[PDB]
C-alpha cells in the first residue's frame, strides 16, 4: 500500500489461500514477484 | 530506485526509525 507514494495501484490480500490480486504498472508486479520469490524465503 | 537487502545480524526494528 505504501509502496507507491503518498495512490494509484492497487493491492488486495488473501489470508486464507496466500493470495495476492495488484492493480498497477508492470515493473511494480515484477519488481515485486522478485521481492516476493525473495520474500517467501526463511 | 528500488532495492531489497539482507542483514546478518541487524534489526529492521530498530533501523526502520533510523531510515
Known sequence: NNAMSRAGAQVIAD???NRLIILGP???RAKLVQLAQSLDTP | DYSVINLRYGWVMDAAEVL
Open chain 1, 15 to 17: 489470508a486464507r489461500t
Open chain 1, 26 to 28: 508492470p515493473q511494480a
